[PDB]
């Protein structure tokens, strides 16, 4: 039935999507050669959702890879599962972005987005029922931010009735990875708030904190954080591929999770998370998953949700469970902590149950929360952006390409209006 076109831009996006496709190929029993060698019919029942069948018992992941520098794509091709992608969809330039959003959005993106869109159209014409587009990208990377904004605008113009989902890496509250992160983040949000349907805000800081405190990892890598992000990504769309007692596709998620069209940024979560030694000491139950999900320390977004209220909560469970068990847990959660949900939305939690657990687990659950506390993140970004813009810090790099002061001013105004809207609804 429904299908998904996975778009993968930037260095961050390329790495996250490589790990994501490794996980997806593992879930469907597909070896690095593309030949299916699984053990269950459900692996092939909805294999078309992400894979095109190239005759010869081989399947090609319906993925599109975008970058302005060929090094990351070289690493992807040479690494494991590098041959799993049909080499037709490696669309890359030569200049690179240099973390300049203006560059990647007006010059290098303007040069490469035509080939990117041609590949997108070719992949979409092969679809029986296109459901939504997925974009994996960071907000700080010039390639990620610029290519994402430009390509999202173009695709929204071409397909106005399709779902535009993005998984964005947001700036950290303590340590910056790029000096000009604020300009890129502000100019990216200034378009994401207009063209996207929903955006999942994942911060690397929260990932480090979770993998250190919970998983007890001492040497975490980008691979481990990408593994967590990929587990979340797979839990998001597990209902589009496997049967269950209560299924919910992308359209129901977008409807239930976005009360007003502009308040569409969410904080994802995941459960269960345990260290290796502690696995033998804690029973895996639905109450345990519910307790782990609704906890501030397990939020992958660097924002304490106890500082605001929730507009809505999505909780997709995986594995065999009792419906009454999940319902009772959700009722207890809403009743004991009613002070953290807005008074103008009753029945704040929408749930779904998939009958296929992640490999190695008896059951799991994916958390998706629309909390008004993300105004903290947006206000921090706005304040830092204002502090930099008041002194024309690094402004000439953006102005030389074609941007003017009016664009930065309008972006700041839009950001502050979004913050004011979140404050209004809290």
């Amino acid at each position: 039935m429904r299908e998904i076109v996975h778009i993968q831009a930037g260095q961050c996006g390329n790495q996250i999507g490589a790990k994501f496709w490794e996980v997806i190929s593992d879930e469907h029993g597909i070896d690095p050669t593309g030949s299916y060698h699984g053990d269950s019919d459900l692996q092939l029942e909805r294999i078309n959702v992400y894979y095109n069948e190239a005759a010869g018992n081989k399947y090609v992941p319906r993925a599109i890879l975008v970058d302005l520098e060929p090094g990351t794509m070289d690493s992807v091709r040479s690494g494991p599962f590098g041959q799993i992608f049909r080499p037709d969809n490696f669309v890359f330039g030569q200049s690179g972005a240099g973390n300049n959003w203006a560059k990647g959005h007006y010059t290098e993106g303007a040069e490469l987005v035509d080939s990117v869109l041609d590949v997108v159209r070719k992949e979409s014409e092969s679809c029986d029922c296109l459901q939504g587009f997925q974009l994996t990208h960071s907000l700080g990377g010039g390639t990620g931010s610029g290519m994402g904004t430009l390509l999202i605008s173009k695709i929204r113009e071409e397909y106005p009735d399709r779902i535009m989902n993005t998984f964005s890496v947001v700036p950290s509250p303590k340590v910056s990875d790029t000096v000009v992160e604020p300009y890129n983040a502000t100019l990216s949000v200034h378009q994401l708030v207009e063209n996207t349907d929903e955006t999942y805000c994942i911060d690397n800081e929260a990932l480090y904190d979770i993998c250190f405190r919970t998983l007890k990892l001492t040497t975490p890598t980008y691979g481990d954080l990408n593994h967590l992000v990929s587990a979340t990504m797979s839990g998001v769309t597990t209902c589009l591929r496997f049967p269950g007692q209560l299924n919910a596709d992308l359209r129901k998620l977008a409807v239930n999770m976005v009360p007003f069209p502009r308040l569409h940024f969410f904080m994802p979560g995941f459960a269960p998370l345990t260290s290796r030694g502690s696995q033998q000491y804690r029973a895996l139950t639905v109450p345990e998953l519910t307790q782990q999900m609704f906890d501030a320390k397990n939020m992958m977004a660097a924002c304490d949700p106890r500082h605001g209220r929730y507009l809505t909560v999505a909780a997709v469970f995986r594995g065999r469970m009792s419906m009454k068990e999940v319902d009772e847990q959700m009722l207890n959660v809403q009743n004991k902590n009613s002070s953290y949900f807005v008074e103008w939305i009753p029945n704040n939690v929408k749930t779904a149950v998939c009958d296929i657990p992640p490999r190695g687990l008896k059951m799991s659950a994916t958390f998706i929360g629309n909390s008004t506390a993300i105004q903290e993140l947006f206000k921090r970004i706005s304040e830092q952006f204002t502090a930099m813009f008041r002194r024309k810090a690094f402004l000439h790099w953006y102005t030389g390409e074609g941007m003017d002061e009016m664009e930065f001013t309008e972006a700041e105004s839009n950001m502050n209006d979004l913050v004011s809207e979140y404050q209004q609804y809290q």
Binding site: F389, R390, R391, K392
Partner: peptide, 25 residues
Amino acid sequence: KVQIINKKLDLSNVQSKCGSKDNIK
């Protein structure tokens, strides 16, 4: 019958060039 070639040298009034205060308002 000579005198040393001493000149009165001064960078009198030099203003900055980077408009670091142009958006201070």
